């Protein structure tokens, strides 16, 4: 194991430049993080349809970016959506192992508006961590606000 750590900043400025997007399974995009990555990595996206909880690793004019399906959690069951939120991180962890991504800038998956329209940060960190229990990659885990920042440590402080 390396380390895993909460970082208050922007993922669309991360040095690793391996980043995740909240794609939907249609490939059709839109978002905060997603529209910040467009201001870093336009010549870097292939926008395909993707399977639910799966990914597409894209190669571009400076870095490689991973599109992944964050399902809208108001459409799925909680125990089922929780199974898909493990799978979405596990199916990413496979790719972070295979393509040898020894450090990565990783966001939250579909935990905000794309949840049940409400914040599930700590449950999404448990699933980020539960996919990473079978990995040896170092983890820049981003946030914007100091309550959300404190929530990502609070989620690690349920597994310390
Ligand atoms: N640039 C950023 N870098 C890292 N983390 C960020 C960033 N901007 C926002 N976040 C964090 O992610 C959460 C917000 O996610 P989005 O930015 O909205 O993620 P995105 O992939 O773009 O989701 C798109 C969905 O949300 C809305 O932006 C939009 O309506 C769309 O339905 C917050 O908890 C915040 O801490």
Domains of the chain: 1-160 (3.40.220.10)
CA-to-CA separations, 4 to 15, 29, 119, in angstroms, rounded: 16, 28, 21
Whether the CB of 10 sits within 6 Å of ligand 1: yes
Q: Is the dihedral of CA 133, 84, 46, 143 positive or negative?
A: negative
Cβ atoms of residues 26 and 49 within 8 Å: yes
Question: Which has the closest alpha carbon to 138: 107, 111, 109, 105?
Answer: 105
Whether the CB of 31 sits within 6 Å of ligand 1: yes
Compute the distance from residue 114 Cα to the ligand 1 centre, in Å: 9
Helices (H), ranges, the chain: 32-37, 78-98, 121-132, 146-156
Whether the CB of 7 sits within 6 Å of ligand 1: no
């Amino acid at each position: 194991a390396p380390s895993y750590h909460v970082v208050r900043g922007d993922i669309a400025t991360a040095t690793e430049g391996v980043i995740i997007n909240a794609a939907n399974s249609k490939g059709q995009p839109g978002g905060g993080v997603c529209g910040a990555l467009y201001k870093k990595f336009p010549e870097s996206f292939d926008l395909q349809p993707i399977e639910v909880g799966k990914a597409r690793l894209v190669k571009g004019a400076a870095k490689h970016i991973i599109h992944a399906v964050g399902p809208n959690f108001n459409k799925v069951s909680e125990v089922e959506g929780d199974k898909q939120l493990a799978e979405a991180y596990e199916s990413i962890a496979k790719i972070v192992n295979d393509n040898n991504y020894k450090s990565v800038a990783i966001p939250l998956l579909s935990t905000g508006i794309f949840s049940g329209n409400k914040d599930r940060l700590t449950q999404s960190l448990n699933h980020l961590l539960t996919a990473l229990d079978t990995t040896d990659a170092d983890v820049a885990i981003y946030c914007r606000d100091k309550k959300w920042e404190m929530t990502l440590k609070e989620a690690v402080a349920r597994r310390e």
